Write a protein that binds this ligand. Sequence first.
Ligand code: JU9
Ligand code: JU9
Ligand code: JU9
Ligand code: CL
Ligand code: CL
Ligand code: CL
Ligand code: CL
Ligand code: CL
Ligand code: CL
Ligand code: CL
Ligand code: CL
Ligand code: CL
Ligand code: NA
Ligand code: NA
Ligand code: NA
Lengths: 262, 262, 262
Amino acid sequence: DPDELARRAAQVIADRTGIGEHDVAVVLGSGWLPAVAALGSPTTVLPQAELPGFVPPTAAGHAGELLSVPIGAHRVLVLAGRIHAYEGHDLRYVVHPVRAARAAGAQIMVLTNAAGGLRADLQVGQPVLISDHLNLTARSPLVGGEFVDLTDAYSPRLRELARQSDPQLAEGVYAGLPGPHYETPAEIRMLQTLGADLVGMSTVHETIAARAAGAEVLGVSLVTNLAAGITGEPLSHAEVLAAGAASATRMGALLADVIARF
Amino acid sequence: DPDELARRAAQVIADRTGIGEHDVAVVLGSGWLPAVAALGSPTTVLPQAELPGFVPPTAAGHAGELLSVPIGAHRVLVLAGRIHAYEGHDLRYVVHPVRAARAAGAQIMVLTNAAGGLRADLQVGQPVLISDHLNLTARSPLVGGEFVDLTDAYSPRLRELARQSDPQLAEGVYAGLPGPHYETPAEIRMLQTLGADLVGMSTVHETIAARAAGAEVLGVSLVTNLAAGITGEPLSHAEVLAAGAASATRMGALLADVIARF
Amino acid sequence: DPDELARRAAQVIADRTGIGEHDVAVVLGSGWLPAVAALGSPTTVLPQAELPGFVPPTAAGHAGELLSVPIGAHRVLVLAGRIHAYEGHDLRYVVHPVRAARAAGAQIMVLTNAAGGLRADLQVGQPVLISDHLNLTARSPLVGGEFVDLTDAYSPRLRELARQSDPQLAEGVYAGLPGPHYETPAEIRMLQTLGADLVGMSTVHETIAARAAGAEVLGVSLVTNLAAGITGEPLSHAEVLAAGAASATRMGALLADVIARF
Ligand SMILES: COc1ccc(/C=C/P(=O)(O)O)c(Sc2c[nH]c3c(=O)[nH]cnc23)c1
Ligand SMILES: COc1ccc(/C=C/P(=O)(O)O)c(Sc2c[nH]c3c(=O)[nH]cnc23)c1
Ligand SMILES: COc1ccc(/C=C/P(=O)(O)O)c(Sc2c[nH]c3c(=O)[nH]cnc23)c1
Ligand SMILES: [Cl-]
Ligand SMILES: [Cl-]
Ligand SMILES: [Cl-]
Ligand SMILES: [Cl-]
Ligand SMILES: [Cl-]
Ligand SMILES: [Cl-]
Ligand SMILES: [Cl-]
Ligand SMILES: [Cl-]
Ligand SMILES: [Cl-]
Ligand code: NA
Ligand code: NA
Ligand code: NA
């Protein structure tokens, strides 16, 4: 049962961190892992593979960490690494971290991602708040009769707090695709038609599960490249990592500054 | 084999109803179940869970009924409850009722659904004939080399009969999504671009399977809400049920009136 | 492991053909199988079902052949028949032939398909070069962290060579859908919005796997019908086969002429 696995994981988290409730959770994936060093100093570091329900039996050798980090007056669970849908496992693994974090007390989920920029104004290394999303995966993490409204899924209140940290922050619509291939130029022209400003390979199911669980969500993209066809140059995964490493200090300091306002 | 399970189910239906052929079938899901009481008086009521192939081993406790109802001069199989794709089981469960109904003699399938209204003209409680659909599930119920043309999938002849019952009936294009989450406002703007007038979580596979089996299809949506982003208010599943209960008499009397014209 | 199965298949191919490296591969599916007789004279003909990894245990009775054909100065592996995604098996079966062909030495993949024409200029029996694609399947054949850029997926260099064979060849964007049902007219209007010129049921995963493996790709569609809603007439699978048989000589001679330029 997903709820039961989430409660079991939250109990292990409380026991191993010695902290009974974490009120905020942050998910870092590719593009954002370097930012951990500027975000804060963990008081507990746990391998995801040691926690119930996090890592598929299939491969345990590539999973990241769960961190307990004090940020302002909060106790923050930081997921340092995602198991992406493109690994080919059930979505329960994608959204179990959100569900476990909620069961541990998290009222707010900060979901970070890397993205390709579709919109005219965007630059490599630019953070962009997610105002809404397009789920283009043809999937949902909700199974059976679990209904959730996604109006204001990306909390307006939390985007306002982020704009206090940086009043020039852009905001835009994120298209979540399966991956792991990059899009063709024709696909990017299609996404422009569909109203996407950003394109990536994560996040949409985490947002849905978070809202279904009653948590508020803040989404932040790092633009790692302009999308296929815009510059004419080929894309490469090296760009994602390079942008993450280059932006690390700024991005960690931004997240810490915003979370302290919660 | 799906054909074999459909023939076995049709034989149980004939045996238990005492009726050798049902010439019409109706599928009622959320939004439409209250209409049964105005549609007619069943002569046989069977739990779906007692019929071969209807209900996944996984959960038998939420499935509805199969009714045998005389409507005009017809003998009508009424599926009172669907197993939706969002329950997470193979599509064979979604379309097995259509295939079983065909094997029982059904020449016409009336597929009802609840929908969110995308178009400017629509109101809560309004019935809308389905003129065409957009299958946005990335799935098909047809497996292997079973080809079907979907031109005039929603029989023009049957829509004309429905307009005899009510000459002011609107018609529009239904977008079938996986569900079970509601759409974001950005998703609804996308669906408007794609040409959808109605959005829901059923029907498209039933229509495909019906056409592949050689049955004519009439589709009828009940608008239960305007789609996300139109009013600015959040959506809720309570709206679907409330609209169904409020419209019950009108909707049952409409279906009976149209089916009598077949 | 897909790589291991591809290497095992390539070793069987080398052993049974007596040819240590095939430098070009061609995939023929519905619409194109008749063209084999004009393409060349195979030196070895193997059932796909005898080769590691080609055919699912589920059904071995419908799979085609693998041919070794000398075309110009090349040694060409010709896949005479595809196992389509709509058969319902893992994508590894879809893309295993490309991966096996690469492991056998193939530097260039020629991927043929049948398609419905969405664009104003197109005629039944017309070959059209694929300039780009839209993958509308919500799937990828790449599993885990295998990243590939799809800029110039359909090699500009190879399309130029094809235009030497026939300077009037049209080019357009191919939309790959799951199938096996045809599209509704509303779906076709949607695909026009999304920028598709051609619509079919194959190819996109083969292209992705080919690019990930480091092969160049040439894509060629045969227009077998105008898409749903354009003429108003219903579509039928008979049209695909009839167009394939009628175009056989021209299409085989075209492929041979282009491959000799590689
Ligand atoms: C190319 O390989 C990857 C692998 C993983 C991710 C997401 C990781 P996350 O931080 O969400 O956990 C991305 S995201 C990404 C940046 N630019 C593009 C692009 O142009 N198209 C589509 N997607 C992306 C790209
Ligand atoms: C919100 O929960 C549900 C659950 C089930 C159904 C379908 C049942 P059926 O009668 O087809 O068997 C719907 S349908 C529906 C009404 N308004 C919307 C909307 O705005 N978006 C998308 N879909 C719907 C909604
Ligand atoms: C109708 O049945 C089939 C079965 C198989 C294929 C593809 C075989 P391939 O050569 O790629 O291996 C097609 S392709 C096709 C032609 N016209 C249409 C159309 O109008 N819509 C969508 N698709 C097609 C159609
Ligand atoms: Cl990650
Ligand atoms: Cl990273
Ligand atoms: Cl760039
Ligand atoms: Cl129902
Ligand atoms: Cl109801
Ligand atoms: Cl409303
Ligand atoms: Cl084939
Ligand atoms: Cl053929
Ligand atoms: Cl035609
Ligand atoms: Na995740
Ligand atoms: Na059903
Ligand atoms: Na294939």
